[PDB]
Design a protein around this ligand. Structure first.
Ligand SMILES: OC[C@H]1O[C@@H](O[C@H]2[C@H](O)[C@@H](O)[C@H](O[C@H]3[C@H](O)[C@@H](O)[C@H](O)O[C@@H]3CO)O[C@@H]2CO)[C@H](O)[C@@H](O)[C@@H]1O
Ligand SMILES: OC[C@H]1O[C@@H](O[C@H]2[C@H](O)[C@@H](O)[C@H](O[C@H]3[C@H](O)[C@@H](O)[C@H](O)O[C@@H]3CO)O[C@@H]2CO)[C@H](O)[C@@H](O)[C@@H]1O
Ligand SMILES: [Br-]
Ligand SMILES: [Br-]
Ligand SMILES: [Br-]
Ligand SMILES: [Br-]
Ligand SMILES: [Br-]
Ligand SMILES: [Ca+2]
Ligand SMILES: [Ca+2]
Ligand SMILES: [Ca+2]
Ligand SMILES: [Ca+2]
Ligand SMILES: [Cl-]
Ligand SMILES: [Cl-]
Ligand SMILES: [Cl-]
Ligand SMILES: [Cl-]
Ligand SMILES: [Cl-]
Ligand SMILES: [Cl-]
Ligand SMILES: [Cl-]
Ligand SMILES: [Cl-]
Ligand SMILES: [Cl-]
Ligand SMILES: [Cl-]
Ligand SMILES: [Cl-]
Lengths: 599, 599
């Protein structure tokens, strides 16, 4: 129906947009650079539309990418995406390994409140705030880290991941408590508890090792799982998700053991998600045909269940059930790609009328800590599955809607799996030369205005701007030149020594020097304005994106020769601030913007 | 009793405190300089405790000082004050002449509401605001100007004053309307109308010329005067004052014409003011014996009536009346001088426990547009009669009390005349060597703080202050120096070339230049900070009284030799802003504050 190969290609590329520094050489995102290089643990993914590293959903997402490869990695050769999927996985797993502290792990980098309060690009966030890290041993987060490393060890043939998988499982199983998992509270609190993570990690360890001691562990955890309301059945009326992976583990155990109890659970759970329901009970459906579990990330939940339904259907022989689950699964993915009442894609940069304003700071590319400016995103977040529509299929593409336009690692994870399965069946051709280059704006530039013009002076208001975004970046050795023609000064019988440079306003905190009037050639001279720590000019807020200086260049009082109209840097200036190419900007000795006399 | 000659001396000096620029050579007030030099009409008096020129009370006050001279000028020779009084009068009369615009006059300089919103000294007001002027032909204001110039012409034997008196009277009498008199509304609105001013002006023109046409005019106005309540009597239950001079005019006519009607009015009016009253009707009196006409300026009203009572009593023969009126007059003046329930003078700088916080901006001498700082006035407003106590004799000396502690040209005007009468009778000797010099504070100076000290730099926050007050004034060519000892630099093997000056903040609107590091002698070097238009540093408000600059003097990053502890200008500095004598201030090449290295 869709080009699933293209959807997969983009859905994978999304994770490169989420990478924290240092970026691998294979990163394909021209608007990302090395960011958060002062973090206690480097690499990993930023979780969602901001810059916190949250280990629970990050590891969940990595585990799901591993599961996609485990089930369908051989099957996706036509798409050309297998290696992109493997490398993206490896990048997150390396971070999970790097979080090891022995009796504990680093489970979070970033304070959620401070990080989310600020709206700007990853590469400059250290100018705005210092980022704390958090250490603990919560069974849920450590157990999910274990599971991710366990499946990763299989699909990447990597003994180090396996060793760390085992270690993390042992720590999570020794601890049996989420009491040390505090830093994600309210963002990714442990809602279901940690027994489901122990089940999920031990199941994957069994599949990784063939060691029946892990199978025995897995099976011993099923009585500790949460019940469905006040009944004796294991909870089944929810989705496999970052908080709770027992749904997928039961499916794995049904295939691995053949046991009736796991198949019974799998069919009860999946039937509840299908339009046909389970004995009269069913997930909410929108009139447009989307299984709508909850307000937050409904597309995430439905697309993850699509992956589970595909895996389960592929593992059984019954033609009626296989069809029912396959149809359900394909219907939810197709909804996400455009088969919905609005006939629109919910995947950024894919298909018809995709969302253009995802709630994502770095894709937006602002310079002033505002969501509403720029009014269009400067970068394409290719492949991001958004939160999606409400229960009545309603949706509007609005950066302010942090529900419907949210994007996240975990939103994309199960989705990638299901796309792997669909491209495996239907083929499709990935885009060549993906991604294409973006149209860029000017990034470092002077805006200037004539503050005052006199028969003996020119007074300039100049704002040296850093609105960088391809990628956002910091430059310490920033300067700009103001060029003059002193022909009239010399003709009038005066000299350079009769021309005085003064300052009428220098913005607080922007340490600045102004050179003497300096000969270029012929009668062309200039002053250079240099910022000692130009990194303080940065797109982090309304005060900080530009440094303001008012300078005056004056002939003596009572003279009337001064002529700015032959001055190179005066050309086109008005009383209103405007970008000018004739006050060129330098990084050290190198011109990075504008024009130079005769050059 | 009191030294009335000294009281008179001071009461006249008050007017020199009120003079607008350009000041005459004979002005004796060290804390007054040429102010409001851009005014449409120069000279004249500021009205009260601010900087508006209001012509109605200005002209009324000048007419009253004229009247004092007309009655008692030959009688005050022993006080030594005659020429002081005559010159002070002439200064106001010259302004009234300079107001001429042919078919109209300038009747006000400054906007009441705009001027009064600001608290600071006269000499710096043009840095705070641009002052308007107002032209019109209001019969009351033009008529009062005519009267002042008419009596002025007699006592100063000046034909120019008389010429203008006739011109102004003709304009006022032809106009017969206050409709073009609007700019003083709410401050000096015409309450009584203009018929009393035409009566006052024509009476004085009659006395100046002996032309019967003016007497005929005067007599023709009396039926147009306001009535007492719903009777047919001319209004008598008020004071001679800036708004209504028919009381004094009727006294003058009584004496000029000998008519029974005018004597009857005078005795009715004056009786109402005496403690015995007029047939059961009487002005309110405080328990302490002060005639208390209204909340505003009760001392002003009672002392003006004292002068009228003296004049009337001196012009009649009946010994019962003479004594009643004299006793009334003397008791009111003596109350003002100290014969009251507090035994205190209500005349600034005179007698026992006089007021120390009159509501007067320029005498206060602030630098930051506040009444509470400084907590003591910087200057002595000698001779000013304050508003006075409340109806129950209560009073506290408080700058916030714009009623009890108000001072004004018209408060002093009748008062001077009554003091002339009492000194004529009792003599007294004026103070030799009056006024004595005031103790001064530092006016121009740096306050500095160590903003940051590093092992390779000194960073200074410096505020160049203008808290001038003797007089408040503006200095264009301001600079200060920061002196260092570079001995440690040379000993480490470095040179002056290796020390770099940068700016971290320079206050908006303060055009500044910083010199290169400049050799003084031996290993002593300095930088000069120069403000090109230093007049923008001025005591007009919290922002403008000092210019703030943050400058850094740095050895190379990483070096370890920098030693500010041997630097002349670093001595005594802390992290807290404080005045320092070691960053000396210059006006041009002249040192005006602080010390230099070498003695
Ligand atoms: O009680 C019903 C089920 O709750 C499931 O936990 C969910 C929480 O109830 C829900 O608040 C939470 O929402 C997240 C959301 O998933 C995430 O995208 C967003 O950024 O933050 C929200 C607040 O954390 O989701 C979890 C997981 O779906 C339990 O897992 C389940 O056992 C229980 O039946
Ligand atoms: O109505 C009674 C009498 O009024 C007199 O006018 C006075 C006003 O009523 C009074 O409001 C005004 O008060 C001034 C005050 O003199 C001045 O010092 C202060 O700064 O401002 C106040 C508001 O303008 O004073 C006038 C004059 O005394 C009439 O003159 C009189 O005919 C009438 O009987
Ligand atoms: Br811990
Ligand atoms: Br925009
Ligand atoms: Br005033
Ligand atoms: Br004080
Ligand atoms: Br050193
Ligand atoms: Ca859980
Ligand atoms: Ca030129
Ligand atoms: Ca009047
Ligand atoms: Ca030194
Ligand atoms: Cl985030
Ligand atoms: Cl919560
Ligand atoms: Cl986009
Ligand atoms: Cl493309
Ligand atoms: Cl060029
Ligand atoms: Cl003079
Ligand atoms: Cl006032
Ligand atoms: Cl009496
Ligand atoms: Cl005083
Ligand atoms: Cl003295
Ligand atoms: Cl000295």
């Amino acid at each position: 129906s869709y080009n699933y190969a293209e959807a997969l290609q983009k859905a994978i590329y999304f994770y490169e947009c989420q990478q924290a520094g240092p970026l691998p050489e294979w990163n394909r995102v021209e608007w990302r650079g090395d960011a958060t290089m002062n973090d206690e643990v480097l690499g990993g993914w930023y979780d969602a539309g901001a810059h916190v590293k949250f280990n629970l959903p990050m590891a969940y997402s990595a585990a799901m990418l591993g599961w996609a490869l485990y089930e369908y990695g051989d099957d996706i050769e036509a798409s050309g995406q297998r290696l992109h999927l493997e490398r993206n996985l490896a990048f997150a797993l390396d971070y999970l390994v790097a979080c090891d502290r022995g009796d504990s792990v680093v489970y979070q980098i970033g304070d959620g409140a401070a990080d989310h309060k600020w709206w700007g690009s990853a590469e400059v966030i250290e100018k705005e705030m210092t980022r704390p890290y958090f250490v603990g041993k919560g069974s849920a987060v450590v157990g999910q880290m274990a599971a991710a490393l366990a499946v990763g060890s299989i699909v990447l043939k990597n003994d180090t991941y396996l060793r760390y998988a085992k270690k993390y499982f042992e720590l999570a199983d020794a601890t049996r408590s989420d009491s040390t998992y505090t830093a994600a509270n309210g963002f990714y609190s442990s809602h279901s508890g940690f027994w489901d993570e122990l089940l999920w990690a031990s199941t994957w360890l069994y599949l990784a090792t063939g060691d029946r001691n892990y199978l025995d562990k897995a099976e011993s955890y099923t009585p500790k799982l949460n019940r469905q309301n006040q009944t004796t059945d294991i909870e089944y009326q929810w989705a496999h998700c970052w908080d709770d992976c027992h749904y997928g583990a039961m499916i794995l155990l049904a295939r691995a053991t053949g046991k009736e109890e796991y198949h019974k659970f799998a069919q009860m759970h999946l039937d509840w998600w299908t339009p046909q329901g389970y004995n009269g009970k069913r997930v909410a459906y929108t009139p447009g045909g989307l299984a709508h579990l909850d307000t937050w990330g409904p597309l995430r939940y439905a697309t993850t269940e699509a992956f589970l339904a595909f895996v389960y259907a592929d593992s059984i022989n019954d033609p009626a059930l296989k069809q029912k689950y396959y149809n359900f699964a394909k219907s939810q993915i197709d909804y996400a790609l455009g088969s919905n009442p609005d006939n629109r894609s919910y995947v950024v940069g894919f298909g018809n009328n995709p969302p253009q304003r995802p709630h994502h700071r770095t894709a937006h590319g602002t310079w002033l800590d505002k969501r509403d400016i720029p009014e269009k995103h400067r970068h394409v977040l290719y492949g991001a599955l958004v939160g999606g529509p409400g229960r009545d299929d309603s949706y509007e593409d609005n950066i302010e809607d942090y529900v419907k336009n949210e994007v996240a690692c975990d939103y994309n994870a199960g989705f990638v799996g299901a796309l792997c399965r669909l491209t495996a069946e239907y083929g499709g051709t990935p885009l060549a030369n993906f991604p294409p280059p973006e149209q860029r704006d000017d990034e470092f530039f002077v805006e200037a205005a004539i503050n005052q013009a006199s028969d003996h002076f020119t007074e300039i208001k100049a704002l040296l701007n850093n609105r960088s975004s391809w990628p956002a970046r910091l430059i310490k050795d920033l300067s700009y030149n103001y060029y003059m023609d002193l022909t009239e000064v010399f003709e009038a019988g005066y000299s350079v020594d009769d021309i005085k440079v003064t300052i009428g306003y220098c913005e607080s905190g922007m340490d600045v020097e102004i050179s003497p009037i300096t000969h270029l050639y012929d009668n062309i001279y200039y002053i250079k304005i240099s910022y000692i720590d130009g990194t303080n000019i940065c797109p982090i807020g309304q005060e900080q994106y530009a440094a303001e200086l008012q300078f005056r260049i004056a002939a003596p009082q009572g003279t009337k020769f001064w002529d700015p109209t032959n001055d190179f840097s005066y050309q086109g200036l008005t009383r209103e601030l405007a970008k000018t190419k004739y006050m060129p900007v330098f990084d050290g000795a190198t011109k990075i913007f504008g024009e130079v006399p005769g050059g």
